Amino acid sequence: AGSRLETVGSIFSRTRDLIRAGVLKEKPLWLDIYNAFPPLREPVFRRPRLRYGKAKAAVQDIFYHEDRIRAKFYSAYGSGPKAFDLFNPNFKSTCQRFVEKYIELQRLGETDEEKLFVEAGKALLAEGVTLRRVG
Amino acid sequence: SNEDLPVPMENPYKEPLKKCILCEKHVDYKNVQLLSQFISPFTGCIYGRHITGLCGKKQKEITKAIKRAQILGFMPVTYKDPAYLKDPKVCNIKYRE
Amino acid sequence: VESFASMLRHSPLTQMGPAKNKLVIGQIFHIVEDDLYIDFGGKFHCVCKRPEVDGEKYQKGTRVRLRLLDLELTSRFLGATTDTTILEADAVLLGLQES
Amino acid sequence: NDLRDRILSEPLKHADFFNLKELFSVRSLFDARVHLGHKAGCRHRFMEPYLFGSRLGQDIIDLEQTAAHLQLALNFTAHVAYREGIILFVSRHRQFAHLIETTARDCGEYAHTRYFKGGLLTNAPLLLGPGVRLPDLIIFLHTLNNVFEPHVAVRDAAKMNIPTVGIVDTNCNPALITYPVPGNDDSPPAVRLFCRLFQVAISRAKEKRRQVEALYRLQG
Amino acid sequence: PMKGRFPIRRTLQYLGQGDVVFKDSVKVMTVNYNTHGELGEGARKFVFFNIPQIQYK
RNA sequence: UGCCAGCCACCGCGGUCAUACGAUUAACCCAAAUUAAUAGAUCCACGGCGUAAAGAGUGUUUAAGAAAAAAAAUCACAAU
Ligand SMILES: [Mg+2]
Ligand SMILES: [Mg+2]
Ligand SMILES: [Mg+2]
Ligand SMILES: [Mg+2]
Ligand SMILES: [Mg+2]
Ligand SMILES: [Mg+2]
Ligand SMILES: [Mg+2]
Ligand SMILES: [Mg+2]
Ligand SMILES: [Mg+2]
Ligand SMILES: [Mg+2]
Ligand SMILES: [Mg+2]
Ligand SMILES: [Zn+2]
Structure with missing residues (x-):
């Protein structure tokens, strides 16, 4: 008949060696195509064991220095008056304007926080955005 | 040499830890008013954490304080002192519905 | 060629950071009697209850002003391996796409 | 007979035979919402190496890896479609059921979206009929069923010696699927994307079948 | 033998294979070694392996 | 014959139709030996210790051992 054991190995293994003994006398289609283009990993059964002890994930949380600025933008003024759209691919809000004003003020050689912040804030008061200034 | 990668930075968006109503205050057993607020009006009972909503430290200090104000004779055991019934209301208990 | 992280970086969702109390613009793809299913575009749709204010205006194709509360609704419960997702997000209806 | 073995052994020697490379890009999948996962609470443990990073608690899939896999996926799908075999689309997702069914009938392919x-x-043989031929290729638009378990057909196909191509999400268990594509099964532009990508892969495959068959008929 | 962390040295073979034989002059042998250092390392290794072979022979 | 007379190394067999008893008949296996009884040879744990036999009511030390780097910080406050 065949091998219905889901655990034992990848379908490639089961099939290939099944044929190999002469039990299955008809090669399936998918076996030949699979010989042509093997996928990244062999689909072998693995047991979803939970982690114990000091073992933690390998994920790297995602952060940039831009965010270290956006943190202070939000800290002062709040979310931008332009609202947001995740529909528009290239969209950039008030916060992005603030980030790039602060970047171009950073290459200017000002190491101080208040200078960069307030002068990128006037740099924004020039372009026509309204910074509410929440307490 | 890809400069768009992530930074191994600490969380900038990290919020401030919330604080008990007494967080970095100080409690003495010599103010019976303060201790009154955390006590039940009709009973003279001491509200649990789920009502007062204080950290462990501040709750324990509140309690030790209530006891110490009671046996020395600063505060009555069996009721809230009438004077303080009309004070500000901290707790989440609604008795009357 | 644009590296993927490069695309991630300037994308309007990253510029937002935390979704908390955010101002978002969204669009309604589906309607039930009182209930508007609103895609603001993040991942999950959120859901809203049609207001007494201009009830008949919010419709199919209608755009709305959302106040985003949570990006997606999830929490862990007693003796669970993994959490439980609602397949929704939390948002409030402020007004309709003021123009 | 000899030239049948010709017509079949021909497309295997050119990796691009259907030219699917042009159907999409990293940008394509990016505006398709594909890169978004569930929370890092809900994450699967076998979804770590396909993942990119955790942005404020919400996971992000790696779209370069996604592109690499999905390439092989549509490659395979087309390759069985040319070789004249059955394809069954499974999903338990009620949002997109209609979309998928419509995709299936329009491919001239089969869909089970239902209990x-x-x-x-x-x-x-007892369920379907006295003797029956079985799907050569299954395709999952979700690896889940509405109670958030691995969908049966994963296990079943795996048991039945059938390859499988499906979209895993941050919370799915990939290990028993033949060709996974890491991506977003939850958001609508995503499923529309995947629907049409698989659809076109199929249409191209069957077309090439008609034409190379016409070639075979002219050769004599 | 299972217990022990290098049980292959409690083998009878490992005792007859290790080769040093001592002259008829040698009677007492002292091994003075140190616990903590990376400079006593190979010595402790000499204790933990070879002393078995020496002694057996 | 009928829980009787008996039988068995272990399980067990006999209460009226016993392939287990006594006696036939066929067979099987040893063979100038064959069975019974008693001792040996062999046979535990380099296994284990929540629920199965097994972590002593607690702590310290003597003997006797074992060892890379970290191995003293504080009550969220009810030791004696
Ligand atoms: Mg009788
Ligand atoms: Mg008789
Ligand atoms: Mg007998
Ligand atoms: Mg007899
Ligand atoms: Mg033994
Ligand atoms: Mg045990
Ligand atoms: Mg005993
Ligand atoms: Mg004990
Ligand atoms: Mg003792
Ligand atoms: Mg006892
Ligand atoms: Mg040690
Ligand atoms: Zn506090």
Whole structure:
């Protein structure tokens, strides 16, 4: 008949060696195509064991220095008056304007926080955005 | 040499830890008013954490304080002192519905 | 060629950071009697209850002003391996796409 | 007979034979919402190496890896479609059921989107008919069923010696699927994307079949 | 033998294979070694392996 | 014959139709030996210790051992 054991190995293994003994006398289609283009990993059964002890994930949380600025933008003024759209691919809000004003003020050689912040804030008061200034 | 990668930075968006109503205050057993607020009006009972909503430290200090104000004779055991019934209301208990 | 992280970086969702109390613009793809299913575009749709204010205006194709509360609704419960997702997000209806 | 073995052994020697490379890009999948996962609470443990990073608690899939896999996926799908074999789209997702069914009928391909009767693949002859031929390729638009378990047909196909191509999400268990594509099964532009990508892969495959068959008929 | 962390040295073979034989002059042998250092390392290794072979022979 | 007379190394067999008893008949296996009884040879744990036999009511030390780097910080406050 065949091998219905889901655990034992990848379908490639089961099939290939099944044929190999002469039990299955008809090669399936998918076996030949699979010989042509093997996928990244062999689909072998693995047991979803939970982690114990000091073992933690390998994920790297995602952060940039831009965010270290956006943190202070939000800290002062709040979310931008332009609202947001995740529909528009290239969209950039008030916060992005603030980030790039602060970047171009950073290459200017000002190491101080208040200078960069307030002068990128006037740099924004020039372009026509309204910074509410929440307490 | 890809400069768009992530930074191994600490969380900038990290919020401030919330604080008990007494967080970095100080409690003495010599103010019976303060201790009154955390006590039940009709009973003279001491509200649990789920009502007062204080950290462990501040709750324990509140309690030790209530006891110490009671046996020395600063505060009555069996009721809230009438004077303080009309004070500000901290707790989440609604008795009357 | 644009590296993927490069695309991630300037994308309007990253510029937002935390979704908390955010101002978002969204669009309604589906309607039930009182209930508007609103895609603001993040991942999950959120859901809203049609207001007494201009009830008949919010419709199919209608755009709305959302106040985003949570990006997606999830929490862990007693003796669970993994959490439980609602397949929704939390948002409030402020007004309709003021123009 | 000899030239049948010709017509079949020909497309295997050119990796691009259907030219699917042009159907999409990293940008394509990016505006398709594909890169978004569930929370890092809900994450699967076998979804770590396909993942990119955790942005404020919400996971992000790696779209370069996604592109690499999905390439092989549509490659394979087309390759069985040319070789004249059955394809069944499974999903338990009620949002997109109609979309998928419409995709299936329009590919001239089969879809089960509905309650999955337990012994369908395991016990075919009693369920479907006295003797029956079985799907050569299954395609999952979700690896889940509405109770958030691995969908039966994963296990069943795996048992039935059938390859499988599906979209895993941050919370799915990939290990028993033949060709996974890491991506977003939850958001609508995503499923529309995947629907049409698989659809076109199929249409191209069957077309090439008609034409190379016409070639075979002219050669004599 | 299972217990022990290098049980292959409690083998009878490992005792007859290790080769040093001592002259008829040698009677007492002292091994003075140190616990903590990376400079006593190979010595402790000499204790933990070879002393078995020496002694057996 | 009928829980009787008996039988068995272990399980067990006999209460009216016993392939287990006594006696036939066929067979099987040893063979100038064959069975019974008693001792040996062999046979535990380099296994284990929540629920099965097994972590002593607690702590310290003597003997006797074992060892890379970290191995003293504080009550969220009810030791004696
Ligand atoms: Mg009698
Ligand atoms: Mg008789
Ligand atoms: Mg007998
Ligand atoms: Mg007899
Ligand atoms: Mg033994
Ligand atoms: Mg045990
Ligand atoms: Mg005993
Ligand atoms: Mg004990
Ligand atoms: Mg003792
Ligand atoms: Mg006792
Ligand atoms: Mg040690
Ligand atoms: Zn506090």
